[PDB]
């Protein structure tokens, strides 16, 4: 039989009509322009670290490393933490955990330079066995 249901037009996108109601401008641009410029200003920082040492470097190594890495592991976590394969709630939960990563690393570093040897006297020590 050619005796069966009337069908529907196939799922297709419609660039114009789907344009009408949805016009926000939330440009991630400006934020991105900085965190490159930041890793671009992290450059002279890292060879100065081979050279200048002590508790004053230590601080702002760990202070600047934090900021790069917070963004970094956000970047990472937004990739692999696909809402498709993870489902919505468990994907907020890797996204929350990514500030819990950031915040922690710091407590851990801050502490390290305060009640252990600091990073610059660590990287001395290991380089001596």
């Amino acid at each position: 039989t050619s005796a069966a249901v009337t069908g529907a037009a196939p799922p297709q996108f419609d660039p114009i009509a789907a344009e009408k109601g949805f016009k926000p401008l939330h440009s991630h641009g400006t934020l991105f322009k900085i965190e490159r410029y930041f890793a671009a200003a992290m450059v002279p920082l890292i060879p100065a670290a081979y050279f200048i040492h002590g508790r004053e470097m230590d601080l702002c190594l760990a202070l600047a490393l934090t900021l790069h890495v917070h963004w970094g592991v956000w970047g990472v976590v937004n990739d692999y933490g696909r809402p498709f394969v993870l489902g919505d709630t468990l994907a907020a939960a890797v996204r929350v955990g990514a500030y819990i990563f950031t915040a922690c690393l710091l407590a851990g570093l801050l502490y390290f330079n305060e009640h252990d040897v600091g990073l610059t006297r660590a990287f001395e020590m290991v380089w001596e066995l």
Binding site: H28, G29, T30, D79
Partner: protein, 249 residues
Amino acid sequence: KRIKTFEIYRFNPEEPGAKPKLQKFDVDLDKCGTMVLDALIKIKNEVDPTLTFRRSCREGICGSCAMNIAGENTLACICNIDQNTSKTTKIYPLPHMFVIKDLVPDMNLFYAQYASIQPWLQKKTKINLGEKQQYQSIKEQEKLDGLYECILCACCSASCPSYWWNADKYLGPAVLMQAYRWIIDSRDDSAAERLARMQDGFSAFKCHTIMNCTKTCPKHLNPARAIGEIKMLLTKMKTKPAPLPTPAN
């Protein structure tokens, strides 16, 4: 007689819960043409007609044969078979695509994503559709070089692991590069808003700059170069309008 041995993704969707098996074919390089596609039509006609895939042009121009030959995304049609018969060349459909069948990936996403970028000419005041040629000096239109040729084969895209992972939200190399082609068309006034469409953190900026896409393009274009230039538009530097239709025009 040297017998080259192929290994090709098979999926049968009609069969009840079927798993994707990798199939083994030998083919006589003596009674078969130079490219891989040649060998694929050989094995369909001669061995096994169920071996299903997409093909046209046959001259490197449509992009319907895009698939994954010996690890890389490239055009089966202009792909030389590995002349070394002791190796064993093996073929897969564009990575992280939903396979309808055998070698035929559900392209529809990739296609819709195209449609997004509004891939026609647009101007700030209406113009008479059948009237005069908008001026574009030779130097302006050299900017579209590297850009219009894209056959939309989706090799790049299906090679960019960004796209594999977040295809929903990341436009992905092929598709972006085209959008750029519309923002530096010295004749297109939508530069402004056409950039506004891909401002957010995923659709555009999800290029973690891997470069896989330019390496795999069979048409030897360069999608990264564009993406780059787009990042520059989303942040610092500008599109620059054309010198006016110098009169007698």
